[model samples]
Target chain A: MKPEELVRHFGDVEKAAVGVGVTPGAVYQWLQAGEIPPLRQSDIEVRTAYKLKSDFTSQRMGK
Target chain B: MKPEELVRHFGDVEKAAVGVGVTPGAVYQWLQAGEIPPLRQSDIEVRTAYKLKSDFTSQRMG
Candidate 1:
């Protein structure tokens, strides 16, 4: 899932922070930039009982 | 920008639908699938007063 998906899942930065046990500011730093750190990725997965899977693979670029 | 970014930019499907002058059903169809049609992408650009530029170029993948 994309960072927006995670942010949407928790409704906003504050809620996501609550679920991941971090400050909203920290969550915003990545969330706003559409970057999801792997650690938070795992936390979101476990927090949601594995409902949202991590599939951050990129499918549109060329070398 | 990515499809996910477009979806997030307009907040949600209904709002995006309204902004793009289409039914939410139409918007949701693409939004849910994370597919931004080129036409709609242009529409979004005009609707947003050009705030959301169409930088749909991809940056990852071989």
Candidate 2:
């Protein structure tokens, strides 16, 4: 399977970033700097990142 | 962020099926049955589906 790139695959990089605890502006900064860390390939790791951000907001509900 | 749908979201439904331990035939059967039940909204729920299927075969690796 194609490795997951949360930003590339999510179709909404900013939202996905924020969903993972980074802000939209932070996402822009990272993108402008051309730096995105590799995400670990584990379901828990992915879900933890997502849940951490979910507490802040879910782009799904426009939170 | 759309609510996750393992079968729909994953590009390769077949691989996703196998990943979750369900055979390709099972997936096809479900599709043929035209019955997809609602999925719960936990991240675990979504990942479990993908991971379960990930083990069977990865379409991406090919």
Candidate 3:
């Protein structure tokens, strides 16, 4: 997910962390990076109930 | 279809597992276990060929 999409979805970095099963600050770092890494994408998608899709470009797109 | 597909696509067992957001060891275990889960199948399908279908059930049943 992109930084803004995460913000829009969970509405908070802290909340996004819980949704994705990561530390609260993890989203913060990812947000700073402007993209979620591919290694973390599938789990996040599964955990989020598929609300977040693994786009073909999420890996090489914005980050 | 098998653990090797992941390696083929992502290039390495270590890289392939996490390339789809799973534990590196789990893919190996999947190879050892001799089966791939549907969820994993779905994820990798998303990564590569949308045409590689699991056909979980009849898409258009009567």
Candidate 4:
């Protein structure tokens, strides 16, 4: 699973991070820890990550 | 000019901050300092802030 490829789908980590309400640092931490599943990396999937981040932010922001 | 309103247009400080690469804390600090341009706020306008944030992050990540 290429985390790098996942980044391309989202248009870069900064934008992805922002869209998800995560600091870039937080994204890095997740990557480093392999919290992003390897299968996802292989498939170059993006929706799940976006949804995860968005859901967390939505909960936090009470939207 | 309502900075708060600008936030709604973009979603919120957290998302906006992440999108831009700045820490959420940093966004809060800027908000407190009133560094975000006022006329832009009065416009209830969008685009400029998102662009500004995008450009800044692009430069930094480069």
| DockQ (Cα-based) for each candidate | 0.02, 0.03, 0.18, 0.04
Better of 3 and 4 by DockQ: 3
List the TM values for chain B, per candidate.
0.64, 0.42, 0.68, 0.45
Error of 1 at A19 (Å): 1.5
Runs of candidate 3 with Cα error greater than 4 angstroms are A57-63, B1-29, B33-45, B48-62
Instruction: Kindly list the per-residue Cα lDDT of model 2 for residues A1-63, writing each as its tens digit.
Output: 011245655557666565555666656655666544322223323444333332213343456
lDDT of 1 at A39: 40
Which residue pairs show collisions in model 3? none
Tens-digit lDDT string for candidate 3 (A1-63): 576686689888788888777897788888888887764665555455456766553553443
Q: How many residue pairs clash per model?
A: 1, 6, 0, 4
Best by lDDT: 3
Computed on alpha carbons, the lDDT of every model, listed in order, comes to: 0.58, 0.42, 0.65, 0.45
On the 0 to 100 scale, the lDDT of residue A6 in model 3 is 68
- The complex in candidate 2 yields a DockQ of 0.03
- Those runs of model 2 whose alpha carbons end farther than 4 Å from true positions after fitting are A1-63, B1-5, B37-62
Score every model by TM-score.
0.40, 0.26, 0.52, 0.27
Q: What's the true lDDT of residue A18 in model 3?
A: 81
Chain A alone, TM-score per model = 0.69, 0.41, 0.75, 0.44
> Residue B38: error of model 2 in Å?
8.2
